[PDB]
UniProtKB/Swiss-Prot annotation:
Major place of residence: secreted
Catalytic activity: Preferential cleavage: Xaa-|-Leu > Xaa-|-Phe
Sites where the protein binds Ca(2+) 4: 193-194, 197, 200
Thermal behavior of activity: Thermostable.
Note on cofactor: Binds 4 Ca(2+) ions per subunit. Binds 1 zinc ion per subunit.
UniProt organism field: Bacillus thermoproteolyticus
Protein name: Thermolysin
Keywords for the protein's UniProt record, in alphabetical order: Calcium, Hydrolase, Metal-binding, Metalloprotease, Protease, Secreted, Signal, Zinc, Zymogen
Record-listed Ca(2+) 3 binding positions: 177, 183, 185, 190
Cofactor: Ca(2+); Zn(2+)
Catalytic activity, EC: 3.4.24.27
GO MF annotation list: metal ion binding; metalloendopeptidase activity
Residues involved in Zn(2+) binding: 142, 146, 166
Residues binding Ca(2+) 1, per UniProt: 57, 59, 61
Length: 316
């Protein structure tokens, strides 16, 4: 809509207060004109029809419980936009400042969130397994990174390529969580998963085996479930990324950590320049080594640490 850019105030899913960019035209709308071609948040009204109605509010204050998932979807889309622009010089998910649209209150008791090719979609969860999924910044950024992948490498969502696709989304979901300084960790989905249970998550990047996921190529899942293990085998790559950043000793291989910024630069270059739709784990290693070589030089510690980390998880 056309109107005056304003700043409202609201509370997110976890009860935290934040300012959000809105647009005034009789009502205040969840329309952020400050980022690219805009960030737009919609009410799906518990239907499965998309996108629903552009979110309208009478007083620019968003403290109702019904408001909370919209506040966080809107705010965390903006944080993700800022991360890709400020850190990687990428303008929105397509690199051409495409508008980011999100719908909240999708369906009823729906324990999922997804990028559907043109917008974000968030369920509210069932209140036991999940609370509204836009409350997790790493979830938001994970799903928006699938859009980045679709517009660059085009990794297909099965077998090793699909596990890479998932791991890329976990890596940048985590780097956005650190960028925002929003209770950062190397776990995925901890802020919205099992509200009754403290200290768990959907999966761990620092210790995938904590939840039974593989942390070495020799332990990879080889069956047909989960599209060939896309959420299971991602642990192999997630552990390598953790080692590249933080260092450690894993299956007897010592890795010198190089930190989070260089992790992000190496993987962003690999994704945007070198990966293809059917890249496998071995090709990811080659792409990451070449990216580190491009950025830091063939004899650098950065290249040596990438090699060490992939050796540690058994990927040659
Ligand atoms: Ca209000
Ligand atoms: Ca996390
Ligand atoms: Ca929990
Ligand atoms: Cl560990
Ligand atoms: Cl371990
Ligand atoms: Cl470690
Ligand atoms: Cl170990
Ligand atoms: Zn997803
Ligand atoms: Zn995913
Ligand atoms: Zn966290
Ligand atoms: Zn798992
Ligand atoms: Zn899965
Ligand atoms: Zn280990
Ligand atoms: Zn370890």
């Amino acid at each position: 809509i056309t109107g005056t850019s304003t700043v409202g105030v609201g509370r997110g899913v976890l009860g935290d207060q934040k300012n959000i960019n809105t647009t005034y035209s009789t009502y205040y709308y969840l329309q952020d004109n400050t980022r690219g071609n805009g960030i737009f948040t919609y009410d799906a009204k518990y239907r499965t029809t998309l996108p629903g109605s552009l979110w309208a509010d009478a007083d620019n204050q968003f403290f109702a419980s019904y408001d909370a998932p919209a506040v966080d979807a809107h705010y965390y889309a903006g944080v993700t936009y800022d991360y890709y622009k400020n850190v990687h010089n990428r303008l929105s998910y397509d690199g051409n400042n495409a508008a980011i649209r999100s719908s909240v209150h999708y369906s009823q008791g729906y324990n999922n969130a997804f990028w559907n090719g043109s917008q974000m979609v968030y369920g509210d969860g069932d209140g036991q397994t999940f609370i509204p999924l836009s409350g997790g910044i790493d979830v938001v950024a994970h799903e928006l990174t699938h859009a980045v992948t679709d517009y660059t490498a085009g990794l297909i969502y099965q077998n090793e390529s699909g596990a890479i696709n998932e791991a890329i989304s976990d890596i940048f979901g985590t780097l956005v969580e650190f960028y925002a300084n929003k209770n950062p960790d190397w776990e995925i989905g901890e802020d919205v998963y099992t509200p009754g249970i403290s200290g768990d998550s959907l999966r761990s990047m620092s210790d995938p085996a904590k939840y039974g996921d593989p942390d070495h190529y020799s332990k990879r899942y080889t069956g047909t479930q989960d599209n060939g293990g896309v959420h299971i085998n991602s642990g192999i790559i997630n552990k390598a990324a953790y080692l590249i950043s933080q260092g450690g000793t894993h299956y007897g291989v010592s890795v010198v950590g190089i930190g989070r910024d260089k992790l992000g630069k190496i993987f962003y270059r690999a994704l945007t320049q070198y990966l293809t739709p059917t890249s496998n784990f071995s090709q990811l290693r080659a792409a990451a080594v070449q990216s580190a070589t491009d950025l830091y030089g063939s004899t650098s510690q950065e290249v040596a640490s990438v090699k060490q980390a992939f050796d540690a998880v058994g990927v040659k």
